[PDB]
Amino acid sequence: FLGFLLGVGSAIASGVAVCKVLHLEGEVNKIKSALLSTNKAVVSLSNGVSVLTFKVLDLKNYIDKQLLPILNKQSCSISNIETVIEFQQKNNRLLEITREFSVNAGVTTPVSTYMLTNSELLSLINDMPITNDQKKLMSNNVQIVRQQSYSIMCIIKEEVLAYVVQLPLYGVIDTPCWKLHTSPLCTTNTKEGSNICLTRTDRGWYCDNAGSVSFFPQAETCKVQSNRVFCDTMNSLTLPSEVNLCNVDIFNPKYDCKIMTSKTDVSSSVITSLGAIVSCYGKTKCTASNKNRGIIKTFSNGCDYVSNKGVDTVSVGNTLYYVNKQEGKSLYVKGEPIINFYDPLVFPSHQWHASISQVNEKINQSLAFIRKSDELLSAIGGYIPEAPRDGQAYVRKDGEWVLLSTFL
């Protein structure tokens, strides 16, 4: 829900900035001529930035040691084999690379094995200025690293081709993360339409980070891998750790927990890491089953939960959700649905987004500025009008100031 609080980056501004640098006439030669015939220099340029460079395919030479070993006794003959194969499959790579940039207009991700080979990838990961915890991590998860990398077509010149490659740096590793799953909480009372609901909007991934918490509102900009979560900080907000107080006591004075109000009590489920939340409302059929032996729990209206120990499946309405079979312990923490603490009669109809205390404020606003303007109207059938400004000194009597006659 909270993705519209994200800022907005420019994912390949760094790669493109390296590219821009390669176009200063002198700069390419400097690269070419520094890979003279080492295959991995670390050139520096006109602005004088540290460009680790890396030649992965010499075809100038390979073709100019069989333009020569074939421009002589061909025309024309049969040569042999070995020299086709070695080529065939070098050129091949370049064709793959070339496809990729063609269809993605010069920018690709994940970064392919043709764009950079495990062999090549693992060297880079090896001379990287990073700790060994990182080196290992990247090394045990190359296809993930590929998925977080971009490749950028850069220059094609007389006889150089360069592209920039943007590899993830994992500056934060092995800190404790967690995932918050939420579903709508409503009253379950009987006349369709009388009901009110509230949904914590603060779902996503959360990871401890540099004393604060990094929060990811679109929980699918994070890929889990057994028990490691790969995220990208570009799609995160930095929050006080107090945000976790929302899972301890949603009313806490230290952090103002985000919710959404409505009257739309419709049924659904959220499948968690080790079970299912079920928000069953109205006439909906909501169920949970174990595979071998069918339905084993039937849900009542309101919001409830089953672990994955024994359950394989959960059905809500006409939607069958398979549950994750991941091993872990769940714990069902009993408590009173907080929607039960609110008078429907001055609950906010819909509120895109608010916080617990914002709702509280509106409710005061409404409570107060009703009953003051009500014990105001609890002084009526008991006030009296102005007797004319033409000198008249009547004496209050009858529901009118009549032409008197009795006790004066």
Partner: protein, 78 residues
Amino acid sequence: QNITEEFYQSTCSAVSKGYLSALRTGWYTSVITIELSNIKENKCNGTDAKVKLIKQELDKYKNAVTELQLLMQSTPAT
């Protein structure tokens, strides 16, 4: 991995714990290069066989290079 989860009945929400971070904070950029040759057409009349199939994978080469050139001279988009 000691993955655990708590459901909160008060608020219809649940938290799964036990996970370990790997966050992309930054980028390593490095230039990747490929040395090319350019050739004239200077080929052959011929042949027997195994220079007919060599010339082909080399029509292909020129094709590739042609496309990349065609990725002419502007910013690529994020």
